[PDB]
Symmetry: C3
Subunit: 99 residues, 3 copies
Amino acid sequence: AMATKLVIAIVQDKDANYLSDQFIDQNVRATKLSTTGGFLQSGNTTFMIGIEEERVPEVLEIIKKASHTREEFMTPYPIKVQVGGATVLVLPVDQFERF
Amino acid sequence: AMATKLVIAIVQDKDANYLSDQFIDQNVRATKLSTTGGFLQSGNTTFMIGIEEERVPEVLEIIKKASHTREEFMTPSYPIKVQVGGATVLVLPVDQFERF
Amino acid sequence: MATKLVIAIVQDKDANYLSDQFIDQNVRATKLSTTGGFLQSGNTTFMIGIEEERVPEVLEIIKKASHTREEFMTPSYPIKVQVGGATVLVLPVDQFERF
């Protein structure tokens, strides 16, 4: 009855710190890779998360809050500029073990 | 309401440059990792692609062309024909896919 | 064809022996270096495309190579310290190609 799923969240380096700390204080075993992506093929991070099915939406909301797309004020006259964004996918898991 | 899959493509560092560019000019959101593999446990690169089911075959063809196994002529630091490239790829189902 | 993918997350200290194990065992693993755990420290992840029939074989290779245990460590009176431990999940795959 151990219905397990894997969530893969791709996320911006900026938000990756706060998120990973969130996961911990939220009792979520995440493992973090660093990747590239985007038009400019810049750096970002990817998370992989073995989690029980029942808890997924908990996890997704954790992410949304941490890394949703927003705009902020930035100076090179400050300007509103867009930051953040997360793409995430949750895969099924046939079997899950800890050794 | 659009069934998406995830393709994972493992590929030669040599061809990863061209491919990744291809993905972009062809509107494929791939994310690229730096890995090791093979008998020598040397460096290659892995790709991860969240894409709609209907589009998978397209993506595979993009890969095959960009990274299939071939032979090339190479002089050793008189020339000889050696094998290069090669790509392994898996496509797996995804239950749910969100952008935030 | 009946391919499955195993992701195995495993401690840096065990990863060398494991990766050699895979090779000598005709298992094609690809290896990422990642971080995880409470302290957010380096470990390593493996991804392994494999015929369904061989999964338990692979799993055993892993359990043996990376299971959790205690060893004798000296702080820089030897002491028993716990080490290793792996966590692994095997997922289905719809389609597998080599090019």
